[PDB]
From Swiss-Prot, chains A, B, C, D:
Residues the entry annotates as binding NAD(+): 13-18, 91-93, 114-117
The protein's Enzyme Commission number: 1.17.1.8
Residues of the full protein shown: 67 to 347 of 347
Gene name linked to the record: DAPB1
SS bond list: none
Family listed: Belongs to the DapB family.
One record GO biological process: lysine biosynthetic process via diaminopimelate
Domain of life: Eukaryota
Active site residues of this protein: 150
Protein name in UniProt: 4-hydroxy-tetrahydrodipicolinate reductase 1, chloroplastic
Molecular function per GO: 4-hydroxy-tetrahydrodipicolinate reductase; NADPH binding
Length: 235, 235, 235, 235
């Protein structure tokens, strides 16, 4: 019995390398994928939007849209989902973020919105944010050195809250090096991603997460990746 | 105005390389160090224990003992502090741990007891324990590889709680490597300590922490390093 | 003036993810790519091999074949190149390696044969082999720990020659950790590859290398990646 | 049969933390240590230098001096050894280096002079220098990032010779990170030392090395750590 069993997604972003990875991952999970898309699959022109989508959501009431698109399209693509009344999971970056949440909360529609869908990265982030809030000053006097490439903005925000001083594509690489005042203690965290699979699997995870909240007819309609993580592994 | 200003410690362990590091660190903090010790400083024979110590604690009511000693001496050295009524900070390992806490709670005496006093290591531990409890399963399917040398037992306990599979001297070294199922994501944590300075500074930290709880006449008498970390930097 | 300027390759392996990366890299270098292939490009059936290829090599005398194929095809695909008399660069693994060199040396034909074409990896290898031969025993008594994933067989051969004790897809990851006897010294080497671009660029490098040896009418006909590295950067 | 068996050293630097580590290491190797010293052991005033030392070197013809001292004392302490005619191993930094070699080559006296005595560090250096000279340009276009603390000047000299772009106490730490142009390949070297034991053991190694060259009545009188490494492990 697959866990995606009984769930359908529409993947608006079918051509992007991200969209593909999502398709691959959803297919593994047993999530069925409807063969229509927007701006094997039949892609659709950017007119007649409501009617194509309303009639899919009518034919597939278990449908959840996945949106991985363009910052200019966010506020537009969200105004569409809310008028049709279909839940969605959106990891796209950009747009009037305040207007985008406004749109969805007036619609009382169900959604997961997180510009970052690598759920393992989020967890490490959240730990280092809990640590910074629970144990203020614990690393007072330590220095931080960073190497990166082409997210780490919160990480430095935490280490400052912890008392430290400091000055989607293929690969990503992050290295953070904590040194003690007398330089006799070093901590080092290092992070390598090759591909977008980690983001796919987290998108699928939000999907499965969000199907459950719909089914349970939950009162909160809008969720983030931390919400997803707290539910536990649904796989 | 130093923060150790107004605080005195007796360092039972004056000859151990640890004891020295504590002395060095306490001296930096402005903590005054009484020149008597047990089993520059005048070391004392293991008889007449109560009287030597009672008359120091009478002469120095702001005294806090620091104990870094032998596992066989723990339950004995604690029964002494409680009869004199002097607060202590004990990082020694071993002994009947249940009998040792029993001894101190009957005395209603003030103490910090943590076999691990590198407070930065504790914080990382606590983050990874919060993460494991808040986000069950977040790393389901990841494999863990470990390299070590001559603590990491909880770390593997967490990563199992997070869904992962797996098979005091001079230096210490720990490396932990998390790999994703498709092996396209890696996290790596690495940890090097050279010396005992990190433990000294944390012992001093518990001391300053514990002076405050005494002064404030706090109701809880027995604390651990997590308690110390939650107070914030006192330096 | 591109450095691939004036050079043509045929890429037998046009469909493999490796073959693609080679095409991408050769295109950057200015290497022209003929649109025929074997077992945009027109792929050809596995019969009439000599005639198709003889007439390309007649039409394109500056042609160099690149072969990234199947171990069963090595000894066969090499017997073809030698009868036509066309230089090739082959990174495929497998086959009767002794029979494969026999085939080419009787033909007195020009070739680069290296199952490993990431030239940067080869260099590190060669350094650690020079070190092992020049400085026998230099790491006598050090221990070696290794983490890997899905090459490192020589690396351990070296470190044994240096006195140490020990027990093509998307990503690759290698970590090697040298620890001193008293465990107060650690060296750590770490190696991450995401993609096949590094192998492409080295294949192209052998190509440019081999065009020069042909042009200069050099007496040695068969080369490896070390030969390529000693020539210097040709880019 | 210890390998230091039959060899005696005088350790001018008996009080420095380095000198101690050397003593510890020489004692392990079976090297006998004479109980006189300069500027258990009896330390000597800085006058009557020649006579004290001439009469030790007369009483102990197998003596080899080890010098770990002050830059101002180098040129002076070397002029002393040469007039007495006693071999020495000197890792001290500073002084007129040209005048210091001049002094020793006129004396035709036997010596090892290397400001760096961690022989394992030297080996890695020499490999990366062989690599830079044998394979010019091999890392053309790679970027280099460096983290350090309180040597690496040659390392960057090599990586520039390899085509890369770039902008004695307790602990030491070095991390070097090589990234490919498309950022899909990373190499990382990392280096941690805690203590001076690694330098001691290399000093002892030069000593044993130098006893052999004396015994064999070798024609070259002045050696470096590379010479020591090429002999092989003498332990």
């Amino acid at each position: 019995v697959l866990p995606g069993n009984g769930i359908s997604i529409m993947v608006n972003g079918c051509s992007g390398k991200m969209g593909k990875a999502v398709i691959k991952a959803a297919d593994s999970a047993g999530v069925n994928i409807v063969p229509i898309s927007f701006g094997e699959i039949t892609v659709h022109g950017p007119t007649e939007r409501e009617k194509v989508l309303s009639s899919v959501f009518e034919k597939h009431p278990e449908l959840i849209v996945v949106d991985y698109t363009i910052p200019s399209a966010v506020n537009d693509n969200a105004e569409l989902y809310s008028k049709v009344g279909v839940p969605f999971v959106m990891g796209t970056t950009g747009g009037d973020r305040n207007k985008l949440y406004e749109t969805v909360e007036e619609a009382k529609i169900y959604a997961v919105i997180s510009p970052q869908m690598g759920k393992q990265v989020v967890a490490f982030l959240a730990a280092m944010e809990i640590m910074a809030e629970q144990f203020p000053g614990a690393f007072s006097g330590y220095s931080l050195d960073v190497m990166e490439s082409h997210t780490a903005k919160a990480v430095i925000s935490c280490f400052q809250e912890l008392g430290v001083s400091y000055d989607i594509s293929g690969h990503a690489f992050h290295l953070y090096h904590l040194t003690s005042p007398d330089e006799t203690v070093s901590f080092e965290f290092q992070h390598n991603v090759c591909g977008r699979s980690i983001y796919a699997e987290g998108t699928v995870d939000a999907v499965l997460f969000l199907a459950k909240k719909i089914r349970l007819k939950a009162d909160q309609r809008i969720y983030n990746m931390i919400d997803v993580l707290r539910e536990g592994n649904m796989r």
